[PDB]
Design a protein around this ligand. Structure first.
Ligand code: CL
Ligand code: CL
Ligand code: CL
Ligand code: CL
Ligand code: CL
Ligand code: CL
Ligand code: CL
Ligand code: CL
Ligand code: CL
Ligand code: CL
Ligand code: CL
Ligand code: CL
Ligand code: CL
Ligand code: CL
Ligand code: CL
Ligand code: CL
Ligand code: CL
Ligand code: CL
Ligand code: K
Ligand code: K
Ligand code: MG
Ligand code: MG
Ligand code: MG
Ligand code: MG
Ligand code: MG
Lengths: 196, 216, 201, 239, 204, 234, 202, 213, 233
């Protein structure tokens, strides 16, 4: 059980993900990264079945980078989200479906920040905030309660923390640390891990 | 075949000095129904080799078609080489194993009898490609009812005359008629010697029912 | 089975037991679970013996072709990725493989866990196999990056030993290897019964 | 030039590649077939190009089914290929329909195969002509001949190869409708000896086969003793 | 049920020289709402729309692949597609997947591009078409929708009355379905304009 | 000219020039001899060495326990055909648990090699073989040709100046059936020696020998192993 | 279904009931289960109606073409062989129990069974279908070597009537065909023409 | 539902000496509660230096040994030398793994001489996992044989006994004893014991009678 | 114009004969086999001082016990060398042993004559390879040198030159070769011969040399090791 979260402010998208790789009753890695850089202003966050998750995300990543090399400019976040969706949907009924749940976060020069949610069935929804994993059941209502559309990034990192503190308090799984990144006009920034 | 349809019961064989005898009743059963009461379950393959088959009779007819055509093809060449009993047994082992491995067996258990270069040949092949040779063989219920009698005689006297082997086979066929509910009292005996393959039939066993009056 | 490995200042320690079972029957006590992929790379065997040995042998073939074609040794990252990409195609068909790919390349000591479920992860320490939970307890309480070489040998040895004691499916001998910058070495092979006499009386 | 492909007609409507294949047949030594009251007899003038060869090398008579013989002239590798096609056709017919292939049908089927090699730049015509012979109580004696164009007809007597005309002239003298296979084998040997050019080609073997009432409808080699008497009759008749 | 995994409801209704089409706004996964602005109705022409309920992924795929085919059609033919022809195009697309269907049951609403006659229809997931002269419904609350439409619909409604009727039919139907709602969007299609409204609606 | 480039083009004389040309590849190969008695089949081959420091080309190849071949013509075509023969032999033992009769294997060669003579853009095999075998019908020597024809032989020679070797073989062939193995191999060597320029001789460097028979699986003799056979010649 | 055919000197008699059921609903009470395959060759069909119609159509095509190519009337044995090849090859995808019967100038009147599974056997007389179970005793006791055409038609009608009384899956009318060098003669027994055997009342 | 496998019984054993290898098997071929034949050995000569023992599903034993026979010849043809014991073992691993998803139901043990002339035993699972062993039992009675060999050849659980090299004479006596013990308790092991001894001089054969019940 | 699989009246394939003529456009390579190992030596043939001489690789490792020298159309040699590398690794995979020099050479030579245009896959080989190869290595037969040309004919040689001055170089090889010659003598001899036949003045940058010995693996001589050997010559 893996957790992803995104929160879109006016000019930025904040994303976080747990850093655990688990197997059976053990955590096998405590500094795992569930984020994939697609381009200077796009992150794909990918969870789900082992093998499928990295294979799918890295395929998308290489194709996004290829588009940049072929054309001299990048796909927009929206175009990248639709490209991702097309591939997942096209594989749904094939001999090689990918059992993956995703967020795509991006910043476009002209359209601003965008956050997209996709499930393994390949339904795509744009959202102001979203979360995947069992931890979403405990945190989405906190986001519904405290969010606003104009939420500043200092305040957004607090809101994120409340979600993460709620997992420490109430969720049955041990998820002690989280990767945190923010995207804006100036590209992808690493923030400090949030750790307990 | 996934589901056998019309089937044959036991086939027997025994080696003797100068040849091999095989026997099989002339019945195709359809479940419990004794449906086709005059079918031959024995094939002359060529001058040195004969075959008897238990199990699905359609699948036997297919093997007979294929094998018969293989022998024709070889005879056309007129080149001094013929398939030996052992070669035919090998081919059949491969054919059954190959069909087993495609999960589409030929639903048969077979007894190959032959005589070539002064040696009696007697070989078994089943639907899974299990194959071996022995001085006597019995498929189906024959494995339980006839094979013990065959082996008991062979232990006292490993080399039988033709007539001794023939009488022993008749005794086994009688037992099978008494105790296999899918048997029938009309059978063939096929013999291979130096002289070739002879199929005799239809034959019947005498039976005794005195025990019917020995209950009270 | 119990296998483990860990990165530290002086390379990567790799250790294993030697037991194979078929149900409850002990089929062998002399299995070589540390697979010599090439002189600078080790793999480990857990799950299905044939599955690990076959696919790591194919890995060895491909790494050598790589070296011939490119005129340099493959990285631990790239080797582990080859293995992951080979097995991924067979997910759901019942392969059982849990392996650690252990080396030392331009990024220093390297350690990846790779399995038949599709996982491929880099890490500081891992244990794999039916006895892994028992090895983790002991390894985790003693592990540091700054372990001296002899302290690292002792920890690895003891963690496998303790796993063999609790885990019915682990036993035999503990085999220990050390990946150094100029290649791996075989460090020791100690029968569990002889280790028992040592760690008690 | 109009003669390089079987897919090109000449301006007069000829297919020269088929005619050239026919020239290969016409260069070969002679084979004959004669149908009679109770069967069909084949004979071949089999030129021996080296005394190093075994008696029996490069047979020009084949069994194509148990009841069907085939006699060939022309390029021998092509002829053997056709004997295999004929064998396969006969075998497939038995598997599919459950009885022995009628001779006329076998001839028609193999002729259509030969014909298929006369239409295309992708393949060349067969450089052979062949006869097929059979006997059964139901169908009587039958003798067919097929050429490189794929034409197939039935015959009382037939000859193919370089002395074809000379052979037909001799066959025409026989009242074959009233003669038995045992009578006819002698006449076949006689005719091969008549048309053999002993100055221009030095050594030959006579190859003989037959199918008829006397073989129970099986195509067989003529027994050695009968062949040797037939040769002695032919040699003495040449006097 | 595969068809209830995302929930959702669509309906179309005929008026005098006008048609209406409506949909709920919820995108959810079983019990969990994920967004409340999910698009289920798509323009296929200036006066021709398709509404899709069912599995959200297939709602999106069918809309996109249909648009692909329609764009090519219009480029080749040099005209706008007729409503009946769009229906046939959709039927063909769905039936191609007869043995592994898309889980969506579309409704179409529009006016003929040359005559402006009203058209409505629905299709099942394998492309069986049904044209009506009143209303069509599709979704997890079809029974609730039938009950409202049967009771409220009348022939030859003007655009204002059509708007109130389709709106009341949707709002009251989805309010008896756990997995449909979170808002209602309504398009009224007339010869000279499209009017798009979102309704004041329950958000539970 | 217009009739000589395509194996699908008959000439106006009823010939196929591409087949004739493929046969020239065999006539220019180094000579090899095959002969038989009632109990053994023997191959003898002259090996060419390109230079004084090269090993001498292999001429004799193993096919199965009961069959070997000597080659003349294109080496790569010889390997291709030898691999086909090997596979046909293996298949026969796999299916029937008995050796493939030699005459049946030669038939298969004839059929396989005829195919490319009749299809546009294919070519004949540019190799001739001598095939030594032993089966239920005894010893055999067969010859195969680029034309796809084949011959059953009392003895044979193919390759450069093989007419000489053939003349020797005809001269002595009435003796071969009753020869012991030693005598038979000597005959093979004498025949092969007829192909050589007057100065040159058979040596352990240029002679290769293959033998199969009633009691002897197909065996190749080269280099020091041919010495026993070369002594007490002349 | 009940089907039957019987050999006489110079021809064959074929017969069938006329009932086709889906479950225990009678979907056709006047089915024609005797299908012409060539001028003097018929088949009696039992098992899946779709399967037997499809196979009969295909054999009719194959045999027609064969017969034109040979310029001769087809052998009954050839027709049976064609059925057998298809029924055996596709035995895992067919539910077809066939009787082939007819006349040809080479072997006269002949009856072949091709039961489920695709074996083939020539018989003096053959029965099949669900209702055949109930008439094995009757046919075994009643059959006599050397029956005339008029006797064979009676024997078939009687056997089919008995089967039809007892088998819920058989009934309706009795369709009969006699085939000989002279041709095919078809008739139907219906109502009171069907042989009657009392219920054993009291 | 057709099953493509049946169990046919059989016990196999191999022992490596300093200059010999032994491969041994019983000769009973079984099915269910029945004996097919009392004279079906489970050992196959591969080369003058290598024998293989095969038990399990007889259909697969027969196919697999024929495949190995073909492959040895193919190797000899392409490389101009016989395959070594080690190379046979490596190859067999790959043949077994080619059927990883429809396995050969065969337990294989190779015994032979290595390239220094020393005894070599390789043991396999059905999908081709293998290693070199000093001794190994396989098949039906393997759990009965293996502990005694551990004790008597491996000296396990024994204090104050000299670890001497294993003589051929003692190896033969052990082989006969463990099979006789197995014939008492494993219903599938019986009739006769066939023993192949591989040394520099070649392969020789002994047979010993076992109980026939 | 005629097909690629056309025989000449002399019984040769035109395309193969023409490929053999292409070998003569290649730079000279020499192989010598001794009881102490084999050496392979090749003229680099530098065409501009701006070209990096280390990017000319006309001697390559096939496996640790086998090297290969090439002459002719060098780009053609890549698929051959790769096939040799892959075959040796397949053999190791399957048999857990090193493949013989003869066997590697045989495997590569089976690709020669696999060309033609109606029979094969959509874009199969249209022509033979314009390359000759010297395979030098050590296996249980000891040190061995094999030569292969575009006909697919391959043969063991005690010493062999290939490429433009191979006549010439082969004559000198006859003169100097003997069976008991040491590896160090063979190395000296092959550089003396290269020095004669090369148009440019021989130095430590415009030749390559490699050895394989029973002792040790394939070894490419470094610049400094070449300089050392070049002093005497
Ligand atoms: Cl019957
Ligand atoms: Cl028979
Ligand atoms: Cl160990
Ligand atoms: Cl690579
Ligand atoms: Cl990682
Ligand atoms: Cl494990
Ligand atoms: Cl003519
Ligand atoms: Cl589409
Ligand atoms: Cl040559
Ligand atoms: Cl060549
Ligand atoms: Cl010729
Ligand atoms: Cl010649
Ligand atoms: Cl019907
Ligand atoms: Cl039936
Ligand atoms: Cl039936
Ligand atoms: Cl029925
Ligand atoms: Cl009815
Ligand atoms: Cl050169
Ligand atoms: K009824
Ligand atoms: K026992
Ligand atoms: Mg999957
Ligand atoms: Mg609701
Ligand atoms: Mg709610
Ligand atoms: Mg069906
Ligand atoms: Mg007992």
């Amino acid at each position: 059980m893996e957790y992803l979260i995104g929160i879109q402010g006016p000019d930025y998208v904040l994303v976080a993900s747990d850093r655990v790789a688990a197997s059976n009753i053990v955590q096998m890695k405590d500094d795992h990264d569930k984020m994939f850089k697609m381009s200077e202003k796009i992150l794909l966050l990918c969870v789900g079945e082992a093998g499928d998750t990295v294979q799918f995300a890295e395929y998308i990543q290489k194709n996004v980078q290829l588009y940049k090399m072929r054309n001299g400019y990048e796909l927009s976040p929206t175009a990248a989200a639709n490209f991702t969706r097309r591939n997942l949907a096209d594989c749904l009924r094939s001999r090689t479906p990918y059992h993956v749940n995703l967020l795509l976060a991006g910043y476009d020069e002209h359209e601003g920040p965008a956050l997209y949610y996709m499930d393994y069935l390949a339904a795509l929804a744009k959202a102001p905030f979203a979360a995947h994993g069992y931890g979403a059941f405990l945190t989405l209502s906190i986001l519904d309660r405290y969010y606003t559309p104009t939420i500043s990034r200092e305040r957004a990192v607090e809101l994120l923390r409340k979600c993460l503190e709620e997992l420490q308090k109430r969720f049955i799984l041990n998820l002690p640390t989280f990767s945190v990144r923010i995207i804006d006009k100036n590209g992808i920034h690493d923030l400090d891990n949030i750790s307990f | 075949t996934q589901n056998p349809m019309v089937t044959g019961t036991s086939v027997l064989g025994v080696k003797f000095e100068g040849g091999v005898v095989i026997a099989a009743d002339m019945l195709g059963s359809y479940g419990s129904l004794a449906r086709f009461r005059n079918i031959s379950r024995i094939m002359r393959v060529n001058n040195s080799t004969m075959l008897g088959a238990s199990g699905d009779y359609a699948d036997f007819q297919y093997l007979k078609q294929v094998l018969g055509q293989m022998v024709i093809d070889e005879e056309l060449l007129g080149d001094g080489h013929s398939y030996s009993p052992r070669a035919i047994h090998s081919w059949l082992t491969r054919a059954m194993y190959s069909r087993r491995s495609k999960m589409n067996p030929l639903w048969n258990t077979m007894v190959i009898g032959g005589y070539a270069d002064g040696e009696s040949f007697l070989g078994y092949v089943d639907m899974l490609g299990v194959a071996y040779e022995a001085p006597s063989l019995a498929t189906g219920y024959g494995a339980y009812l006839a094979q013990p009698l065959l082996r008991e005689v062979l232990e006292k006297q490993p080399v039988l005359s033709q007539t001794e082997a023939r009488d022993l086979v008749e005794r086994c066929m009688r037992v099978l008629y008494y105790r296999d509910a899918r048997s029938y009292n009309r059978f063939q005996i096929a013999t291979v010697t130096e002289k070739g393959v002879e199929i005799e039939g239809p034959l019947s066993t005498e039976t005794n029912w005195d025990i019917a009056h020995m209950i009270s | 089975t119990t296998t483990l490995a860990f990165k530290f200042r002086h390379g990567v320690i790799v250790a294993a037991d030697s037991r194979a079972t078929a149900g409850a029957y002990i089929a062998s006590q002399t299995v070589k679970k540390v697979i010599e992929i090439n002189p600078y790379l080790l793999g480990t065997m857990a799950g299905g013996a044939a599955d690990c040995s076959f696919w790591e042998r194919l890995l060895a073939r491909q790494c050598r072709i790589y070296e011939l074609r490119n005129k340099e040794r493959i990285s631990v990252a790239a080797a582990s990725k080859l293995l992951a990409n080979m097995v991924y195609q067979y997910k759901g068909m019942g392969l059982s493989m849990g392996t650690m790919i252990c080396g030392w390349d331009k990024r220093g000591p390297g350690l990846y866990y790779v399995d038949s479920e599709g996982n491929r992860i880099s890490g500081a320490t891992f244990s794999v196999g039916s006895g892994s939970v028992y090895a983790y307890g002991v390894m985790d309480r003693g592990y540091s990056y700054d372990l001296e070489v002899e302290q690292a040998y002792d920890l690895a040895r003891r963690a496998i030993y303790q796993a063999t004691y609790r885990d019915a499916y682990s036993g035999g001998a503990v085999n220990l290897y050390h990946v150094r910058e100029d290649g791996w070495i075989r460090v020791s092979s100690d029968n569990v019964a002889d280790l028992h006499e040592k760690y008690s009386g | 030039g109009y003669d390089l492909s079987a897919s090109t007609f000449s301006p007069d409507g000829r297919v020269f590649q088929v005619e050239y294949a026919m020239k290969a047949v016409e260069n070969s030594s002679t084979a004959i077939g004669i149908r009679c009251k109770d069967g069909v007899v084949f004979g071949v003038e089999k030129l021996v190009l080296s005394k190093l060869y075994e008696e029996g090398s490069n047979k020009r008579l084949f069994n194509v089914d148990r009841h069907v013989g085939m006699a060939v002239a022309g390029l021998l590798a092509d002829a053997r290929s056709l004997a295999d096609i004929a064998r396969e056709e006969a075998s497939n017919f038995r598997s599919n329909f459950g009885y022995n292939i009628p001779l006329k049908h076998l001839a028609d089927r193999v002729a259509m195969y030969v014909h298929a090699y006369t239409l295309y730049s992708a393949v060349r015509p067969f450089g052979c002509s062949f006869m097929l012979g059979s006997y059964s109580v139901n169908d009587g004696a039958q003798l067919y001949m097929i050429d490189p164009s794929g034409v197939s007809y039935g015959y009382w007597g037939c000859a193919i190869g370089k002395a074809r005309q000379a052979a037909k002239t001799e066959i025409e003298k026989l009242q074959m409708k009233e003669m038995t296979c045992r009578d006819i084998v002698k006449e076949v040997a006689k005719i091969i000896y008549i048309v053999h050019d002993e100055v221009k080609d030095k050594a030959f073997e006579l190859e003989l086969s037959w199918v008829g009432e006397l073989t129970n409808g099986r195509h067989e080699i003529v027994p050695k003793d009968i062949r040797e008497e037939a040769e002695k009759y032919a040699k003495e008749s040449l006097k | 049920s595969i068809m209830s995994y995302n929930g959702g409801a669509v309906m179309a209704m005929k008026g005098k020289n006008c048609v209406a089409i409506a949909a709920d706004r919820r995108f959810g996964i079983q019990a969990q709402m994920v967004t409340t602005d999910f698009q289920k109705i798509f323009p296929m022409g200036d006066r021709l729309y398709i509404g899709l309920a069912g599995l959200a992924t297939d709602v999106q795929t069918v809309a996109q692949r249909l648009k692909f085919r329609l764009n090519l059609y219009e480029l080749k033919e040099g005209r706008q597609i007729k409503p009946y022809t769009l229906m046939s195009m959709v039927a063909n697309l769905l039936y191609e997947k007869r043995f592994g269907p898309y889980y969506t049951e579309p409704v179409i609403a529009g006016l003929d591009p040359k005559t402006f006659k009203p058209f409505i229809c629905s299709l099942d997931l394998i492309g069986c078409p049904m044209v009506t002269d009143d209303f069509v419904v599709s979704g997890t609350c079809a029974e609730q929708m039938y009950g409202m439409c049967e009771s409220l619909w009348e022939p030859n409604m003007d655009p204002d009355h059509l708007f109130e009727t389709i709106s009341q039919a949707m709002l009251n139907a989805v309010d008896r379905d756990a997995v449909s709602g979170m808002g209602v969007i309504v398009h009224i299609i007339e010869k000279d304009k499209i009017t798009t409204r979102t309704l004041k609606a329950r958000m539970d | 000219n217009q009739y000589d480039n395509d194996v699908t083009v008959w000439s106006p004389q009823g010939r196929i020039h591409q087949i004739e040309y493929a046969m020239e590849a065999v006539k220019q190969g180094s000579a090899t001899v095959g002969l038989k008695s009632k109990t053994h089949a023997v191959l003898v081959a002259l090996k060419r060495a390109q230079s004084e420091l090269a090993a001498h080309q292999k001429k004799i190849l193993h096919v199965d326990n009961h069959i070997g071949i000597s080659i003349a013509g294109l080496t790569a075509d010889a390997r291709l055909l030898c691999n086909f023969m090997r596979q046909e032999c293996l298949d026969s033992r796999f299916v029937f648990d008995r050796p493939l009769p030699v005459s049946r294997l030669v038939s298969l060669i004839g059929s396989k090699t005829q195919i490319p003579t009749q299809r546009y853009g294919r070519r004949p095999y540019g190799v001739g073989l001598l095939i030594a075998g032993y089966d239920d019908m005894g010893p055999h020597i067969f010859q195969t040709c680029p034309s796809a024809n084949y011959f059953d032989c009392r003895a044979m020679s193919i390759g450069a100046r093989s007419q000489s070797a053939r003349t020797y073989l005809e001269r002595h062939m009435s003796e071969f059936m009753e020869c012991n193995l030693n005598e038979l191999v000597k005959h093979g060597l004498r025949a092969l020696r007829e192909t050589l320029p007057a100065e040159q001789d058979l040596t352990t460097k240029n002679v290769s020998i293959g033998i199969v028979g009633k009691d002897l699986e197909f065996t190749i003799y080269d280099d020091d192993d041919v010495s026993p056979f070369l002594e007490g010649l002349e | 279904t009940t089907i039957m055919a019987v050999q006489f000197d110079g021809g064959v008699v074929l017969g069938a009931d006329s009932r086709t059921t889906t479950g225990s609903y009678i979907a056709n009470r006047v089915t024609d289960k005797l299908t012409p395959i060539h001028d003097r060759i018929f088949c009696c069909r039992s098992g899946s109606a779709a399967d037997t119609q499809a196979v009969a159509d295909a054999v009719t095509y194959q045999l027609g073409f064969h017969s034109i190519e040979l310029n001769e009337p087809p052998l009954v044995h050839t027709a049976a062989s064609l059925f057998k090849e298809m029924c055996y090859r596709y035995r895992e995808d067919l539910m077809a129990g066939i009787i082939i019967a007819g006349w040809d100038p080479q072997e006269g009147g002949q009856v072949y069974s091709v039961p489920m599974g695709g074996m083939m056997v020539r018989q003096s007389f053959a029965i099949g279908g669900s209702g055949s179970s109930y008439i094995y005793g009757y046919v075994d006791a009643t059959y006599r070597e050397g029956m005339t055409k008029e006797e064979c038609l009676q024997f078939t009608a009687n056997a089919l009537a008995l089967a039809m009384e007892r088998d819920g899956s058989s009934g309706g009318v009795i369709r009969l065909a006699a085939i000989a060098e002279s041709g095919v003669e078809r008739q139907v027994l219906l109502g009171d023409q069907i042989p009657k055997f009392a219920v054993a009342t009291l | 539902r057709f099953s493509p496998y049946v169990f046919n019984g059989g016990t196999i054993l191999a022992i490596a000496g300093e200059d010999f290898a032994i491969v041994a098997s019983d000769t009973r071929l079984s099915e269910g509660f029945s004996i097919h034949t009392r004279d079906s050995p489970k050992c196959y000569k591969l080369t003058d230096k290598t024998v293989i023992g095969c038990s399990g599903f007889h259909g697969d034993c027969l196919t697999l040994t024929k495949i190995i026979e073909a492959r040895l010849k193919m190797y000899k043809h392409s490389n101009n030398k016989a395959m070594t014991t080690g190379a046979i073992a490596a190859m067999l691993s790959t043949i077994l793994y080619s059927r990883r998803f429809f396995p050969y139901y065969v337990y294989n043990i190779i015994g032979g001489l290595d390239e220094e002339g020393k005894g070599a035993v390789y043991s396999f699972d059905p999908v081709g996992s293998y290693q070199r062993d000093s001794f190994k039992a396989g098949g039906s009675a393997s759990a009965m044989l293996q502990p005694l060999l551990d004790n008597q050849v491996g000296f396990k659980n024994m204090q104050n006994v000299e670890h001497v090299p294993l003589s051929l004479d003692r190896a033969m006596r052990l082989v006969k004893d463990v099979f006789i013990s197995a014939a008492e308790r494993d219903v599938y092991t019986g009739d006769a014991l066939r023993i192949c001894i591989v040394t520099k001089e070649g392969i020789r054969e002994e047979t010993v009678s076992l109980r026939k019940d | 114009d005629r097909g690629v699989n056309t025989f000449s009246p002399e019984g040769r394939l035109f395309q193969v004969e023409y490929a053999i003529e292409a070998i003569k456009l290649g730079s000279t390579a020499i192989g010598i086999q001794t009881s102490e190992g084999v050496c392979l030596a090749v003229e680099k043939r530098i065409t501009s001082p701006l070209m990096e001489p280390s990017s000319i690789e006309k001697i390559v490792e096939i496996d640790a016990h086998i090297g290969c020298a090439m002459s002719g159309l060098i780009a053609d040699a890549k698929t051959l060398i790769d096939k040799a590398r892959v075959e040796t690794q397949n053999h190791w995979f399957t048999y857990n042993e090193t493949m013989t020099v003869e066997s590697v050479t045989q495997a590569v030579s089976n690709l020669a004559l696999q060309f033609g245009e109606e029979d094969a896959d959509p874009g199969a080989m249209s022509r033979p390879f314009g390359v000759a190869l010297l395979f030098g290595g050590v296996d249980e037969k000891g040190p061995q040198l094999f030569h292969m040309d575009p006909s697919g004919t391959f043969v063991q040689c005690d010493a062999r030159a290939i490429g433009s001055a191979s006549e010439g170089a082969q004559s000198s090889l006859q003169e100097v070769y003997h069976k008991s010659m040491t590896l160090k003598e063979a190395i000296k001899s092959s550089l003396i011969i290269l020095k004669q036949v090369m148009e440019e003045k021989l130095n430590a940058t415009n030749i390559e040399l490699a050895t394989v010995q029973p002792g040790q693996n394939f070894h490419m001589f470094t610049k400094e090791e070449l300089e050392e050997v070049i002093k005497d010559i």
